[PDB]
Structure formats: C-alpha cells, structure tokens
Amino acid sequence: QSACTLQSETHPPLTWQKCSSGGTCTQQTGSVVIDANWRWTHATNSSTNCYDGNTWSSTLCPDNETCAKNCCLDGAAYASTYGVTTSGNSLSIGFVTQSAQKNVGARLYLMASDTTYQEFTLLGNEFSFDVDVSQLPCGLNGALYFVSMDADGGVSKYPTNTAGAKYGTGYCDSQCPRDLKFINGQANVEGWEPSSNNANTGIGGHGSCCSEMDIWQANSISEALTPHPCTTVGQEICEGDGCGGTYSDNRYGGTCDPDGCDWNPYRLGNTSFYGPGSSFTLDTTKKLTVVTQFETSGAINRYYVQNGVTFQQPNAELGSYSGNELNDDYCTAEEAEFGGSSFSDKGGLTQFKKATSGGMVLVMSLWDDYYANMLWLDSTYPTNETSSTPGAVRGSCSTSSGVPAQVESQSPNAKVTFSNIKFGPIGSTGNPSG
C-alpha cells in the first residue's frame, strides 16, 4: 500500500532510557505508531473505502496486487479515535474508544525516527518497564513484546509498500497472522473470509511469520513470559493453512511455534504470587516494575520490584526441573509434563537465540481475544479439563469469562499504562535515569 494524508500522521512521542555497563543511563527520544490494520484503508484518489466492516471492495480490490496499487493507508487520530496517549516516558492505551465509530484496542511499535522502527538486540541485555494493570480484568491483555520485524516495515523488500513503518506496516509474529490486510506490499483480499464473530476482521490467504518474544502477556489476574521460535528467524510470508497458528485450522503445520515455552507462575503452582490486593506477593492494584534478562546462554531470567522490594521469578518444580530461570531444562520438562512438542520441534531456545542475537521491534498492545477469550492466559484451558490435568489451570478467571462483546460492553474504560522503559547490559537498568 501507499500512504494518503486526508488525516495527518503525528506519532505520539515517548522517551526511554539507554543504560551502560559503567553505571549511567541516558534519555532517548522516540515515538509510537499504530499498526496498519487499525487504519482507514481507501482509494488513493478519493475517500472510497477499500476495506469496510470485514469485507473488501470487489472493484478496487479484485486481487492482491491491484488492491495494493489502488489503495492507501491514512493517518491516525491517536487520542480521539484510538484512545492512545503519551506523556514523557509513559504510554496509555484505552480499551473501547467511542468517536464517530467504536474502536477496540491498539497495537503500537516504538519508533527510532518518524519513518523507521527502533531495533533492540536483546541478547546480553535486559529490558525493564513499569506497568499498571489494575484496570485490566479477566479477558483483557495489555501485552508488551518483541518481534523480528524489518526496521522499514518492509519497504526495501516490497517496493509496492511505500507507506512503511511511518504507517505501521510489516507486522509479523509467531502465529503467522492471516488477519493482516497487507502483507509484503500486497493486499490479502485473495481468500478472504470474514470473521463470524467480529464485525471488523477476517482471515486472508496469506500470513506473516516471525520470531516473537512475549515479555509480558498480562492482566490484573495472570501474567506470562513466553519465547516463540521460528525456523525462519525474521519476517516471512506463508500460504494458507501452511501458516499454522491461531488463524489456521491446523495449528502446527508451519514454520513458527504458536504455543511457546511459557512461564506463568500461577500455572506452575504459585497461586499467591500475582493478583489484586494485599493477599498476593505482587499487588496488581498498584504499579510494578518488571525486568527481563537475556543471558548469552540463551536462558531468560526475571525479577520484579514493587514499593522498593525485589522478588526473583518464583521457584517452580516441574518433573526433573527445579529453579526460576527459563532455560532448556525448563522448556523440555514443560513439554514432558504439560504436553506438546511445538517449541522443541521449532528448535527451542537455541533457535530462539538467533532472534535475540539480531534486531527485534518493541510492541505494546491492548486487546481482547476473539479466538479463545484469553482463557489460555487467565482461566482453565481447555475448559473441559480440571485441576487434575497438569497445567490446565492458568488463572482464577471463570471459563465463561472474556467473551469479547461482553467485556467490551462491561469494561469499555479498561486500560493499560506502560512507563519508564529502560534498556541496556544485564545489571545496568536499576541505576539512575539520566
């Protein structure tokens, strides 16, 4: 797609700290940009929609190439349309925003300049952020994660994409998502099937795969840390059900691991660590600090800070594994005890290390879940299982929770605030901000 300017595009600014091994941190100035799927897509020379509701214009978009030639992405009113605001080092995302139309949620990327994404090399480094999840009930997810996206959003590879990172193009993740309206500078109208339960979405014949580091999938009830390897490290198109992932009838036939090696302290048995109020170790009614360290071995370490008290990731015992580091031994034990082979089939932490050794883009989002009602994060899943099934219970939410239309109606003012991002060598981010 190209870019149009019926609405101007002004990326909300956002600062973050880059810290050094020598003990100081210095302020960086970036901004955030909304993913292209949230945007108005219209004809290049009029206001006629190329996509409307969950269907494409059959005349403007008869096939993927013609559609991309005829159509452009336009600018975003971040606060009034999308409920996205920033202040200094803080970003807030509202759940349901009413303007002329209803918008639900957002997916945002951190920029280096107004036309390029910021890339982070995670290996050997740590990433720290503060988060307020107090206003996230069952069925919502304020996610902060990384994906192996191109810094330009795909422009150099696909010259029929001229909109680029400035307009939030180029997304990929470990689900090989097929709901994207543009992939590789072509539309995804070919094979499009509108969603049965979502007025604004569908599934196309192509998907967009890459490595994904889920630092934070969370609400006020549950949280998880999850690497997802792929056999191709960076962004790559996939074909139909060959994609695998959430958007295909077969979850596992593709190049990415859609399940991941997840670490959820509740799921692993410590039901007292994280939740609302003073009966939990970390009180989710109040702001907390989350630090994630990528040691060169390929293992992942984690600690938290709240009211100046520090907590390592809680210890877990699973089969022959014991400890609080997310390493090969954990992931292998998890597959043995909870089931599955997707993580190891795709190469485990050794393959994942190829992603963190290269550049990945920071993503911050708020969403509800039209495919599985977020039950995989905060409830019992599958819902026929009981607590006697190892790993079935991931949180305290009812198995009836998180129906999107319900939570949209009941909790429209839900929101997440991410703040005080700090990045640098392991051991550096707790030192004074510049």
Added chain:
Amino acid sequence: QSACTLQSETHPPLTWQKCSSGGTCTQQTGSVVIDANWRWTHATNSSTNCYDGNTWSSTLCPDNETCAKNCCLDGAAYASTYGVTTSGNSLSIGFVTQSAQKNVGARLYLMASDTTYQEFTLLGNEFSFDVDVSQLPCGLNGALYFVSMDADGGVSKYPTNTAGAKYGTGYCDSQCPRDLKFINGQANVEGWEPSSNNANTGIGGHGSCCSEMDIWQANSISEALTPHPCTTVGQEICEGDGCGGTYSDNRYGGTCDPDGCDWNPYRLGNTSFYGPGSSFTLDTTKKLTVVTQFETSGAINRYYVQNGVTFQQPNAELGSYSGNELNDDYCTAEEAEFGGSSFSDKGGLTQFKKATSGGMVLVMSLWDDYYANMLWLDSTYPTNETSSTPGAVRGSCSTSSGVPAQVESQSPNAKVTFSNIKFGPIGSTGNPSG
C-alpha cells in the same frame, strides 16, 4: 586431639541476615572460631609443647595416634594474639599481630553454636557481603570462601578428635592441604618435613581434601571467583604425594582440582574494572558490596554494588565464549585458551553442583603466600611469561612482589574487614535487613 583450657575459648560474636523470597530478612546470631593450626598444641597434663616452631616433640608425638592421645588444642586470645575483632555484623582481621610472639594472619569459620559450624546450601541461593580491601597490598589475600566440612569438625567420624568445631578442627579444601597438624583425629607428625622458608609450618604425610567455592580471593589490586570440584565431595584424607595440590611435588595426581575455573576480570582483559582510586569502575580504596548467585543450572552469576551503583560481572570474550556468567562454556573455553585440564578432569560444574547442593562451611581469612607469593592472583604467572601468553597477566603487581618476610616487615598493619553478610534465595538479599 582433645581440648585443654589453660586459655579460655570465647568465640567473637558475629551476626548475619537470612533473607526470604517474600522480601524480608531476619537477623541470625553466630560467632567465629580460629582454625586449629593457629593454636597452641600441648601435652594434656602440662604446658609442654607438642609442636614448637615447625617441629614436633619426638617424645610426645612418636607417631600420629600417640601424638593425638597425648596432645590437646587450647584456647585463643582473639584480639591480642590473633588480631581478630568483631562488632555486630563486622569482622576485622589484622595481618601481623605482636604479642609475646609474632602471629601472621588467621583462618576463621562461622559457627551456628559454640560447638558446631554453620552449614549453608548455596544452590538456588545467593550470598552477599561488604568488604574493605583498601589496606591489602600486593602479596596479601583477604579470602572469603566455602568448603565441604563436617558441621562437628570431624568428631562423629573420628572419636580421638574430641576438640571439634569449638576448636576449629576438620579443615579441608581443594588443595588437599598437608600442612594441617591434625587430620581425622590423628596428628600429622608421620612424614613431617619443616618448611624451608616458614619458621612456623611444615608438610606432613597426610592431607585433607574437599570441594571448595572461592567466592572471593582478593586484595586492593586483584580479585577472583573460583569453583574447585573434587571426585569425593566432602572431607577425605589423602596419602602423601597422592594428595596432589600445592603441598605435593605433583600438583595433579589427586582427587581435587587445585586450579579451579577462575574468573578474574583483569586476567580476562578488563584492566580498568577493579583497582585503587577513581580511575577504576570499582574503587578499592572504598567499601564495596559483592553478590554471588548459584543458579540451579550449576552456573554462577555475580554483581557488585558501590555507592548505590550496580555493576554485573564484566563481559569477557574468550575463544567461542562470550558473556558474564561463569558456566560450562566459560570453563571449557578457559581451558582451551589458557591451558589445563584439571577442572574438567575432576567433573567441572556438574561435579561442583554436588557440593553446593549439600552443606558448606563459611571461611574468612587473611594470609600471605609462602608457596607462590600470591603471583597467581595479582601479578604475571609464571613469571617468565609475558602478556603475549594468554592469561599470564592476572594483575599489575610486580613479579618481585609478595615475598612473605618482606610484606610482613613492610605492611604489618594491613587488614581486611568483612561485614553485612546476607544469605537467601536468589533475588532476596538486596531487601531490607531485619
């Protein structure tokens, strides 16, 4: 040996913090006791010495068993004879102390009660302490480390030892030391050869081997972190040159690894990290905090704190290894690049994990080095090598430094202060002391 009471034995008290994963720490009260080698050894029913200078009484001690039956260890005047003092959570050790005679240095163990050593299970936990090394010049070592000693000092195994932990019996380390006057409730007079260069020491026909975790071998110029595995984990006697270690003509024929997998930031190339004054990252003229974490994988992590600024162990690149965690990959790369096979011959970190999985005793000491002038820590070693030999340079001290008689004459008022010991689960020790 038995115990005599011509001089009373009052262990200087010392407190330390035991911290919990839930974020609090509580004060523990222990004490310190001096190793039996520093003590007066005399006949049970008179003041006649069983050992004097560096030789044994041929009448009281004609063989190892008769010697132990005839002889006892007596009490220690900690401050006036040995230059050992405590205050609250702080311990100070002076280098040369003049009373009726000259004493040099001390080796002390932390006690649980007045008759038992405190045992720590390091695996899954971290150990934090503050140290002032400002008064330690080239050739001295204020060492803090752990060894796999019996809590009773060997009494239950060797009933001819009735003095026990109260009198500092039962020492062992990864050198299989043969300079000990009592091992396994017997004397070590059989095979005794007085030291050519030390008026107070010698080498006997037996040694005492066990696993050794050198958390801190250091002075104001250099510091090293070094695990040493043994094929028998806990305390075990050895026979003559079969002992291996520093005290045998053959270093390597025995059950312990006397070299270890050492991590010295200077040796690995960062000559700016640790030293006296403001030109180093950590200024050794001032107190610093040292934290050592034993992750369940068997790898060791390390960070430092000074004036509220936190520094991870510096990154090092050695062969194909890169990072700041002391793991199998580091130790293997170290052997490939610097030379040697002792660490891996004895089983590496997998064998060492058997020690940290069990109980180890805390040792705090100050010494000079009659065998190698501490050159292995703070100088170029062997002294014929240059900086073109990988790993030869370990510190900035002259290869002429650390002659014991010289440093004893020139720096008698040298000293080390260890303080604010805190121990608990990984991530717990930076929280408030109780």
